[PDB]
Structure formats: C-alpha cells, structure tokens
Amino acid sequence: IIRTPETHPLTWRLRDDKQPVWLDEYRSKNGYEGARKALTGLSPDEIVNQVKDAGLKGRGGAGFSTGLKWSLMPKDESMNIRYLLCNADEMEPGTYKDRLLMEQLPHLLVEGMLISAFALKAYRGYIFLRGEYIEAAVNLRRAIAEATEAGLLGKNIMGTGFDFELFVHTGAGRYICGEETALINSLEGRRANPRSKPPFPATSGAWGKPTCVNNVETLCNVPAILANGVEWYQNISKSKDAGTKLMGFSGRVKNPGLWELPFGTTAREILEDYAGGMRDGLKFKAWQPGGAGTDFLTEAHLDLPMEFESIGKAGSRLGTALAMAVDHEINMVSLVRNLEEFFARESCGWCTPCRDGLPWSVKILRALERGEGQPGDIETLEQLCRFLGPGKTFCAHAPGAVEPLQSAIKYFREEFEAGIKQPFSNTHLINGIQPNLLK
Amino acid sequence: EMGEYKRQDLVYEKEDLLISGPGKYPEYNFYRMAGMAIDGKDKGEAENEAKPIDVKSLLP
Amino acid sequence: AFELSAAEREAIEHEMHHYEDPRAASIEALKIVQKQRGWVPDGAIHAIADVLGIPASDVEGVATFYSQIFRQPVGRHVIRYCDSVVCHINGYQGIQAALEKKLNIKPGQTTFDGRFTLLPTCCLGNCDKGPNMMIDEDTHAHLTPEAIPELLERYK
Amino acid sequence: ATIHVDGKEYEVNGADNLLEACLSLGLDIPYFCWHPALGSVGACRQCAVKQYQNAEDTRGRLVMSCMTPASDGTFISIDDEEAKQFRESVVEWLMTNHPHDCPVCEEGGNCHLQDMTVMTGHSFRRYRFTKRTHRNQDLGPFISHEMNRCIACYRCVRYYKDYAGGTDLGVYGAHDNVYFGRPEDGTLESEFSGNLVEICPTGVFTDKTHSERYNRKWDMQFAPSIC
Ligand SMILES: Cc1cc2nc3c(=O)[nH]c(=O)nc-3n(C[C@H](O)[C@H](O)[C@H](O)COP(=O)(O)O)c2cc1C
Ligand code: SF4
Ligand code: SF4
Ligand code: SF4
Ligand code: FES
Ligand code: FES
Known part of the structure; x- marks a missing residue:
C-alpha cells in the first residue's frame, strides 16, 4: 500500500512501528x-x-x-x-x-x-x-x-x-x-x-x-x-459520497484489518485484495457491512460498491463500513442469538418495544439454538422485526437490533426452522377443568 | 339437602363453608402462580418466574 | 461509615471545574471512587451526592445504569472477556471455558481468594485481533485457551 | 386547528398534542406514560396512531399521539389495523413479565393497565418463558411497594421529581431490570408522595392505609366532599 497525502488524507501520517505521532x-x-x-x-x-x-x-x-x-x-x-x-x-x-x-x-x-x-x-x-x-x-x-x-x-x-x-x-x-x-x-x-x-x-x-x-x-x-x-x-472518488473512508474486514479472514479507501470500493475488493480472502478450508457464507446493527448480506452481494445508497438499496446499511465475514462453520441461529443478547442487554430501558421485545427474541433464539423451538416462534420473530422498526421505538437502537435478525431469517430460514422440534405448549393441564380445544 | 326451619339460619358464615379438602379441583394452587411473596414462596419461586436480579449486579 | 478522602474530594472538584453544571461530574466522581476503592460502596453514593449538590437517587441511578461502575464488591483483578459477535466468530467460548476451568467460577462471580472477578463485556473495539479480553487496565488480544493459564499468572 | 380522525373532521387546539386533543373529543386511545399534568415523553409507545401526509395518502406512518402536535390539517387514524396491532403488541410486551397477581393486588378493579389490556383486546398469551421478578422496598407507612407489577412507564419519577420536587425517588438499573424506588429502604420524604397511588397506572404504589382494610372500587360508597 502506497499512502500519499492526496489519496490517504487520514492515514498517510501513520508510522511503521504503530507509534503515536506527536x-x-x-x-x-x-x-x-x-x-x-x-x-x-x-x-x-x-x-x-x-x-x-x-x-x-x-x-x-x-x-x-x-x-x-x-x-x-x-x-x-x-x-x-x-x-x-x-x-x-x-x-x-x-x-x-x-x-x-x-x-x-x-x-x-x-x-x-x-x-x-x-x-x-x-x-x-x-x-x-x-x-x-x-x-x-x-x-x-x-x-x-x-x-x-x-x-x-x-x-x-x-x-x-x-x-x-x-x-x-x-x-x-x-x-x-x-x-x-x-x-x-x-x-x-x-x-x-x-x-x-x-x-x-x-x-x-x-x-x-x-x-x-x-x-x-x-x-x-x-x-x-x-x-x-x-x-x-x-475529486478523491467519482462517487455520490465524497472523500475517503476507513473500511475493513474482520472475522476468519487471512488479514483482518483496516484500510483507508475511497467510497465505491466493492466489498469483494476489500475481502480479497486487502483482507486476503477467507482462511484455508473455510467457505464464505455471509457478511455484515457496517457493524452489529446492519443486515446480513450473502456472497452475491460482495460485488456492489461500499456506498450509502448502494448498500441501502441492497437491504442493508453501510454503517461504519467495517464489514465482518461469516464462514460456513458458524450457525446463524447462534450468531443472531449472540447479537440479540448484546442488543437486549444494551437497551437503555426507556421504551417498551426494545426493552420488552428484544428479550423475547433472545429467549426464542435460545430455544431455537437448543432445539426447543415451538411453532409460531419464527412468526413471533418476524412480527418483532416488523414492530421494532423506525418510528415505533424512541431511538434507532432497536431497528439496528432487528436488522440482523430479519436478514438472517430472510436468507437462512432453514437453520431457524431446524430449531423447532416440539409442539406449542403454554398451559399445563388442570385437573377438573376441560380445556378449550382451539383448532 | 339444605332445608331449614329459620331463615336466619340460611346465612352460612365461613365456619359453615370451609371444608377439609380441595373439592372438585384436587391440585390447583393460586399462590403457586402469584408473584406476591408469601410464606414458603419467596420472589422468583412462582411458576415461570426467574430469580430477581438486583440492580447492583455486576453482570451487564 | 463511608468518608471521602482528600484526594478523592479534590479530584471530584477538579472534575467539577470542567463543566457548567456540577451534575456532569457524577460519572467521573463514581469512577474516581471506584478507582480508589475497587468499587462504589453504599455510602459513596451519598458522599458523591452531597459533594455535587444532586440527590442520592440521581447518583444511584447513574451508578446502576453504567455497567463499568461496580456497586457490588469485586476481586483484586477484574477479567472482562468480550462476548460480542466478532469474538464469537473468533472463538471466545473456548476462552470462557478455559477461564472457568482455571478459576472454578461462573461469570459474574469472584474467586474464593478474592483475586479474580470474571465478567463478560461488550465489544472492546479490537475485533480484528480477536478474541480479546481486558484485565484491570490491560487489553490482551489473539487469545488462545492454552495461553490463558500462563497469562492469568501475571496478575497476583 | 383542523384534524381528521378516521374520516371525521374535528376542531381542536393547535397547541395540544394529538393524544390530549383526541381524548378531549371522546375518542379512546390507550396510553400509559402520558399524564395531563406531567406532559408527554413518549416512553411507553402505547398511544400509537397512524398519521398520513394528506387526505390522498394510504400508507401512513405510526406515530405517538402524545408526542405529535394537533396541528392544522392533520390526518390520523386510530382504528387503523396496523396501529391496533401495534398497540396490542405493546400491551402484550408489557404482559410478558407481569405477575399473576390481580386477585391479590390492591389495584384490581381500579387498574389502568387492566383497562388498557381489555381496551386493546389482548386476552391470549403465547409467551411461554420466565418472568422477571423484583424485590420490594419499604417506603414508609403510607405507600406499599410492589415492583413486579411495574410496566416502566416512568410516571412516578416524572411526577415525584419533575413535578413535586422530591429527591428520594428515582429509576435505577438498565434494560429490562429498570427499578423504580428509593436508593434504600425508608419513608418517602415528599409531602405529596400519596399522589403516586393514582399516578402509577399499576399496583406498584398502593395506599397501605387502604390496604389494611381493603375493598374494591365497585364496593365503595363515595361522596363529593372537602378535605
Ligand atoms: C444505538 C446507537 C449507538 C451509536 N453509537 C455510536 C458510536 O459509538 N459512535 C458514533 O460515532 N456514533 C454512534 N451512533 C450514531 C450517533 O447517533 C450519531 O449519528 C453520531 O454519533 C454523530 O453523527 P455523525 O456521523 O454525523 O458524526 C450511534 C447511534 C445509535 C442509535
Ligand atoms: S429503542 Fe432506544 S430509547 Fe428505546 S429502550 Fe431501546 S435504547 Fe432506549
Ligand atoms: S397492577 Fe393491574 S394488571 Fe397488574 S396484577 Fe395489579 S390489577 Fe392486575
Ligand atoms: S412504578 Fe408505576 S408509575 Fe413508576 S414506571 Fe412503574 S408502572 Fe410507571
Ligand atoms: S467483537 Fe470482541 S473486540 Fe469487538
Ligand atoms: S402515552 Fe404516548 S408513548 Fe406513552
């Protein structure tokens, strides 16, 4: 990487020994x-x-x-x-x-x-x-x-x-x-x-x-x-978003790191040329473009430029443009469970949908990971993604929380349906009372 | 068979109503469901109840 | 029977100098007390409240809101392992299993000698070098389950 | 100001929000965190209506009626299907952790949460997981404390601190472990702490003096009197 002051305005002053510049x-x-x-x-x-x-x-x-x-x-x-x-x-x-x-x-x-x-x-x-x-x-x-x-x-x-x-x-x-x-x-x-x-x-x-x-x-x-x-x-880049941006790839890639690139660099260029691709024996399953609060994207989305409107039209957010790669050995239910545990425990507690709907999604994902899912759980997750969107909550933390869940259900539904293994049961039998047998 | 001689004696107080067992419902216990703490059931000991997490706990 | 020391009080007023309202020094006052004593005890809430001129309910709400302000006693060294998504991909669960095996405690608990307190924490901003953990003020990256017993012995 | 609610035209005050304007008109919008004396904060998200940009709009957007001004030419729908679904979902989210307490709760028959649960039409439980619980505090001779029943609507702290000027009540903790009370056990020091039993929409703060000789509201004989 050749870092000139005109092409890398943020990182050309960086030293080789990673020491601070006084x-x-x-x-x-x-x-x-x-x-x-x-x-x-x-x-x-x-x-x-x-x-x-x-x-x-x-x-x-x-x-x-x-x-x-x-x-x-x-x-x-x-x-x-x-x-x-x-x-x-x-x-x-x-x-x-x-x-x-x-x-x-x-x-x-x-x-x-x-x-x-x-x-x-x-x-x-x-x-x-x-x-x-x-x-x-x-x-x-x-x-x-x-x-x-x-x-x-x-x-x-x-x-x-x-x-x-x-x-x-x-x-x-x-x-x-x-x-x-x-x-x-x-x-x-x-x-x-x-x-x-x-x-x-x-x-x-x-x-x-x-x-x-x-x-x-x-x-x-x-x-x-x-x-x-x-x-x-x-004149740094011929894109709708002017200037440079710190973009990178993390995960099980060969060279996880951070590089200053103009807007419009494709995700495959960051993944292959800069991050060195995936590790040996690992198949690229998915990626998140801009942090934990962004929608998952598949391998076919690696060719579009890292701009705000290009990622936004793909169904995700550019975010911080620090992408994360997910290989084939990662269970998507476990990953989204980890993400939703983070988001539910980082709720500030002000407003009802985030505070009382993220833990429900967490418990559903825990049941799905353990193979104790029940019918209606994925429907509950989809309705939670629908009802925690922008405007429904007091701030944008809960829409960012429900972006990965809805994207993973959209792209990897077969892993979520594999967790449903028991019939729905919310009531125990009470001796002497015949239940209302709904159809 | 509840026939009576005096109408005042048809007023049944608690000593005339409370029986020695569960009657027609042999197992149900409301206080196993209620979140209100009583003797023999502290907070978090009811059905489908988690233990209370104090706000000074170190976990996030 | 809590009493603020002279250094703690002086640091709190010096923090109060930097804002146009002394309420804005509540987080730094709690962190000063925590840095001196390891955690924030019960009387420290009222002491900080009477120094800053804000109610003790405000100080306690701030202290219980923020996860890094400890309102329960901790060990002499606080291990904070990242349990976020990138370190999950990089394998933080092996690190957590190794720490649990070495310390014989669950997360959120303190060891029997009061040496280590194990805590999960959110992402440490070191995801390209994961899995990461924080001991009291130091960040350790590229963690492996084999290096956990060796690295835990550097903190007495 | 002119507003249009569900196709009906109404004249309201433009300095009011939509919730207070619609409640003044006799319309029923469920709400928890708003109070007429305390203003609007938009916490509970119960008062959702669907606002349209104009008359020839069909998509709309869900807004909080307590946080939305009743400006001239407003177009909203209360009985919109998505708004009704979201209000029922908010009730359902509040009901996931709520204890099975109504028979032994002093607020029963006088409970705003019961009324709004019925008003949204939510009566079927599909949540099957555990309910969070809380220890209670001793708050003095007048106010009994039961934090299991809290819906985190922030009415108590807003009234007590912002309105009444009290200092020993507050909100503590975080995400779903938000706790409303005192920093430690003790009597509530405000001279106006007794209004908490009517400000709180649930049975968290209850009249302990009434609780000693409790009876339900429908069993009372009332009169308009002077203190
Ligand atoms: C839940 C949440 C967390 C956020 N965290 C950060 C953050 O850590 N750093 C940051 O710069 N912006 C964060 N933001 C975005 C800010 O709201 C805001 O856009 C930013 O701090 C300043 O805007 P700017 O990008 O124009 O400089 C966060 C937003 C939300 C909703
Ligand atoms: S969406 Fe924002 S305001 Fe609402 S509880 Fe979550 S973090 Fe707080
Ligand atoms: S606060 Fe209301 S809904 Fe909750 S237990 Fe009491 S009466 Fe029932
Ligand atoms: S204690 Fe009552 S008034 Fe306070 S937030 Fe909870 S439900 Fe609302
Ligand atoms: S995910 Fe662990 S340091 Fe960021
Ligand atoms: S009454 Fe409007 S959000 Fe609470």
Whole structure:
C-alpha cells in the first residue's frame, strides 16, 4: 500500500512501528495548516459552507451531511455559549476505527475539533471517549497538553481572539451512550436515555445550549478539507459520497484489518485484495457491512460498491463500513442469538418495544439454538422485526437490533426452522377443568 | 339437602363453608402462580418466574 | 461509615471545574471512587451526592445504569472477556471455558481468594485481533485457551 | 386547528398534542406514560396512531399521539389495523413479565393497565418463558411497594421529581431490570408522595392505609366532599 497525502488524507501520517505521532512530527507533515488557514483567513460561515460544499458526510453510521448539521445552529448572536462534542464512544461491535485514529494520530482529531469549533463558534469541546480506550485517552490528553503549550488551544488561538478549550470525558461502559442525544445526556451526568427530536441538539443540546455532535472520523476528515481545498476532496472518488473512508474486514479472514479507501470500493475488493480472502478450508457464507446493527448480506452481494445508497438499496446499511465475514462453520441461529443478547442487554430501558421485545427474541433464539423451538416462534420473530422498526421505538437502537435478525431469517430460514422440534405448549393441564380445544 | 326451619339460619358464615379438602379441583394452587411473596414462596419461586436480579449486579 | 478522602474530594472538584453544571461530574466522581476503592460502596453514593449538590437517587441511578461502575464488591483483578459477535466468530467460548476451568467460577462471580472477578463485556473495539479480553487496565488480544493459564499468572 | 380522525373532521387546539386533543373529543386511545399534568415523553409507545401526509395518502406512518402536535390539517387514524396491532403488541410486551397477581393486588378493579389490556383486546398469551421478578422496598407507612407489577412507564419519577420536587425517588438499573424506588429502604420524604397511588397506572404504589382494610372500587360508597 502506497499512502500519499492526496489519496490517504487520514492515514498517510501513520508510522511503521504503530507509534503515536506527536506535535513536532505532526506539524512537520503539514499539521495545523488547515487550522491556520481556517482561523486566519476564513469566516466561520465560510468554513461551514466549505464543509458543506465538500460533501462531508457523517462517519458515525448514519451518513448525514456535516455541513447541513452545522447550518442548523441558530443565527442568534445572543447565544454565545456553544459546544462541540466528539463521539469517541465506538461501542458498536465490529468497529475499531476510532481506536486507530486516536491512538496513533491524536493531533489530527485535536486540529479537526479546533477547526469545527471555530466554524460552529463553539467555545467548548468535549471528546466523549469510551473508558476501555486507555491508550487513546493518554495520547489525546498528551496531544491536548502539547497543543495548549504551543498556543493552538486555549485563549487567543493564533492571535485571532478565538477561545477554545478541549476536554476528554471517559465513559463508563454502555453502548447506548454512542447515540448522540444519549451522549448529550451522559455528558450532563445523567442516565444515558436518548432524547426526542425535535428539538435538535443544534438548537438546544448540551445544557440547553447549541451543540453539535460529530464522529471522530468526520472531525479527522475536516482538516484535510480545509488544508487542501474543497475541489481536492470532491475529486478523491467519482462517487455520490465524497472523500475517503476507513473500511475493513474482520472475522476468519487471512488479514483482518483496516484500510483507508475511497467510497465505491466493492466489498469483494476489500475481502480479497486487502483482507486476503477467507482462511484455508473455510467457505464464505455471509457478511455484515457496517457493524452489529446492519443486515446480513450473502456472497452475491460482495460485488456492489461500499456506498450509502448502494448498500441501502441492497437491504442493508453501510454503517461504519467495517464489514465482518461469516464462514460456513458458524450457525446463524447462534450468531443472531449472540447479537440479540448484546442488543437486549444494551437497551437503555426507556421504551417498551426494545426493552420488552428484544428479550423475547433472545429467549426464542435460545430455544431455537437448543432445539426447543415451538411453532409460531419464527412468526413471533418476524412480527418483532416488523414492530421494532423506525418510528415505533424512541431511538434507532432497536431497528439496528432487528436488522440482523430479519436478514438472517430472510436468507437462512432453514437453520431457524431446524430449531423447532416440539409442539406449542403454554398451559399445563388442570385437573377438573376441560380445556378449550382451539383448532 | 339444605332445608331449614329459620331463615336466619340460611346465612352460612365461613365456619359453615370451609371444608377439609380441595373439592372438585384436587391440585390447583393460586399462590403457586402469584408473584406476591408469601410464606414458603419467596420472589422468583412462582411458576415461570426467574430469580430477581438486583440492580447492583455486576453482570451487564 | 463511608468518608471521602482528600484526594478523592479534590479530584471530584477538579472534575467539577470542567463543566457548567456540577451534575456532569457524577460519572467521573463514581469512577474516581471506584478507582480508589475497587468499587462504589453504599455510602459513596451519598458522599458523591452531597459533594455535587444532586440527590442520592440521581447518583444511584447513574451508578446502576453504567455497567463499568461496580456497586457490588469485586476481586483484586477484574477479567472482562468480550462476548460480542466478532469474538464469537473468533472463538471466545473456548476462552470462557478455559477461564472457568482455571478459576472454578461462573461469570459474574469472584474467586474464593478474592483475586479474580470474571465478567463478560461488550465489544472492546479490537475485533480484528480477536478474541480479546481486558484485565484491570490491560487489553490482551489473539487469545488462545492454552495461553490463558500462563497469562492469568501475571496478575497476583 | 383542523384534524381528521378516521374520516371525521374535528376542531381542536393547535397547541395540544394529538393524544390530549383526541381524548378531549371522546375518542379512546390507550396510553400509559402520558399524564395531563406531567406532559408527554413518549416512553411507553402505547398511544400509537397512524398519521398520513394528506387526505390522498394510504400508507401512513405510526406515530405517538402524545408526542405529535394537533396541528392544522392533520390526518390520523386510530382504528387503523396496523396501529391496533401495534398497540396490542405493546400491551402484550408489557404482559410478558407481569405477575399473576390481580386477585391479590390492591389495584384490581381500579387498574389502568387492566383497562388498557381489555381496551386493546389482548386476552391470549403465547409467551411461554420466565418472568422477571423484583424485590420490594419499604417506603414508609403510607405507600406499599410492589415492583413486579411495574410496566416502566416512568410516571412516578416524572411526577415525584419533575413535578413535586422530591429527591428520594428515582429509576435505577438498565434494560429490562429498570427499578423504580428509593436508593434504600425508608419513608418517602415528599409531602405529596400519596399522589403516586393514582399516578402509577399499576399496583406498584398502593395506599397501605387502604390496604389494611381493603375493598374494591365497585364496593365503595363515595361522596363529593372537602378535605
Ligand atoms: C444505538 C446507537 C449507538 C451509536 N453509537 C455510536 C458510536 O459509538 N459512535 C458514533 O460515532 N456514533 C454512534 N451512533 C450514531 C450517533 O447517533 C450519531 O449519528 C453520531 O454519533 C454523530 O453523527 P455523525 O456521523 O454525523 O458524526 C450511534 C447511534 C445509535 C442509535
Ligand atoms: S429503542 Fe428505546 S429502550 Fe431501546 S435504547 Fe432506544 S430509547 Fe432506549
Ligand atoms: S397492577 Fe393491574 S394488571 Fe397488574 S396484577 Fe395489579 S390489577 Fe392486575
Ligand atoms: S412504578 Fe408505576 S408509575 Fe413508576 S414506571 Fe412503574 S408502572 Fe410507571
Ligand atoms: S467483537 Fe470482541 S473486540 Fe469487538
Ligand atoms: S402515552 Fe404516548 S408513548 Fe406513552
């Protein structure tokens, strides 16, 4: 792999010994130049317009436009207290990209938060980071200290009169905190229940103030845009989704890893050229494109490009674009049981369908795995997938929960029907009462 | 055979109604089904009931 | 009879400096108490509540919401093995069986000497190097059932 | 404001949500987590109706009527088949863990959950697995506590904390182990804690003074009086 600054804007600064790049080495490799240009030559509205014109989309899994999200902030000049939050939670299973970004290139994240906070007029920034990323926390705190010593953080940054303070907030281990409104609730020191929208966080977010929540990779994509120009970012790939993206393959592949690729790279190219294909003696059965909350896809879907609309038309979600391969030796009932156990135990408990319908699916899948399935169980699972969709639950955790279950029932129904081996029995016989024998 | 001399004696209190056995239903016990805790059946000991999981438990 | 130490209290106020509302330091206060004492005991809820100026019900709701804030006593070393989907594909069940054989405990339990507490945990963000587990602050990747007894002896 | 419910036109207040507007019109929408004095939060998902974009719309989308404004020219359906199915499914999900307690529960005959179970028409159980259970707390002389019957509708904590300003009640735990109560055993310190027995739609919080000499609501003789 040849990593040029124009083709790999996020990973070309990575060292060979997997060591973090500190302030002197980062600034030698054109570091904090986009920040200098943004803070000394552009209005915040101009930076927001440039980010919108670059077509930068959200890398957290939803794929929403970053410029459109930034433009929802109020034009009221009386609201001068504003917050930028970096979603470094990354608790979706199968996702390991933000760990690479913040363990080895923390100054890229710091520069991106600086540029985005100047664009959003955000006086404060918080990196909401998961507690298991200890090395990432150490590296981020050291990089923040180095940038504060060099005058890139704090009061009067670059002599421009802009004040910005960046904090690191380490999490306490819940998957629901990665959801943006639940992230805001967790940052306020509350139980991480999500919030209803409208109002959006751009109008009243963290402590009622205007707040923008962005993924680590989006904020890491910002400085390359503002240092190389909008037309460079628009010309990375000839696809509807501009720029690069960290894509990878995990599972029982020969080379599980992570590579920076343009949008439009097919899944077979990532699986064969980069991941090295499956291991010896293993036959490719299925794959998940973007984490635990995405629909399963078959081998015939490996030829379509890894874009938002291409995967979306296939019946799945691009997600984090960190695919996971499933070989023929993996029982799909056991795998979906494991997935639903994760999703049911990571429910925040706010709303009824997720909280009380995911455990029912878990118990049905446990019975199917043990061969104690009963008639009507697959119908119950299908109705649970139907009734836990978007809009029926309070947040998007339960639709993501039911995507793999419905996709596996659609593509591997023969494994689920094999678990049904006993007749349906909900009642025991009561002596003296003749039962109502329904037909 | 419930014929009586005085109509007041047709008011049967609990001592005239409670019998020594189960009657026509020899096995049913409501308190084996109810979740309300009584003597000899704590929480989680009823039919189709799991043991209570306290909120301070270490498991996720 | 819980009493916050001077270092714990000072760390809690220093965390309170970083926010516009002192309620936002509740998770960090619980983590500070947990890091000092191994877990968060019952009186720590009221101590943190009276330091932050929030009700103890709020502190207890936060503490029982988050899985990494321990409200029951744990061993001196907490093994947290990933039971998520990619490590399931990579074979975490052999690792769990090896840990159960070595420690003679079920998940969620503590060993007889109070040395190890076995806990399943969600995905550790190390799925390309699975199966993974976390001991107290260290991540161990590429786990095999044979290396579990050797690696468990590094923590006394 | 003009709304259209099941083909019938109605005039409502545009500053109201759809649940309160429809309940003011005499229509029956099941609900748990909404209260007139507490506002809407959209937790229980019981109040689902089908909203259409316009008059010539046939697909629609399920929305929570408590969280949806009763704006001008709204088009909703309560008796839509999918909305009825989802409301029955929400009742069924609440019923999976609910204890077999109605004969020995003080809320029986006065129970909102019983009424909404009947209103959705759900009477057949197909769930066959175990029911979660909870230990109870001592809450003082007035309020008896039975957390097995909780449907996690969050009404108690919203009333007690957000409305009444009390501090010793809260929600603890996580996914399906959410527990509503005090951090430890003790008397509820609020001067308005007794409204929990009417705020709670189930028999979790019950009038203990009534429970000593319990009788059902249909057996009572009532009068309008002044305290
Ligand atoms: C259940 C759930 C978990 C999520 N977890 C994360 C996460 O761990 N990291 C992340 O960046 N986004 C996560 N998201 C997506 C966020 O809601 C949000 O889209 C993102 O944090 C910021 O948006 P962006 O991609 O435009 O930057 C999660 C969403 C849901 C519903
Ligand atoms: S779907 Fe409902 S219960 Fe589940 S995590 Fe979201 S708000 Fe919480
Ligand atoms: S709370 Fe209502 S439904 Fe539940 S046991 Fe009591 S009366 Fe029955
Ligand atoms: S205790 Fe009652 S009011 Fe509180 S959440 Fe449970 S059912 Fe609702
Ligand atoms: S699935 Fe185990 S580290 Fe991600
Ligand atoms: S009453 Fe509307 S969701 Fe609860």
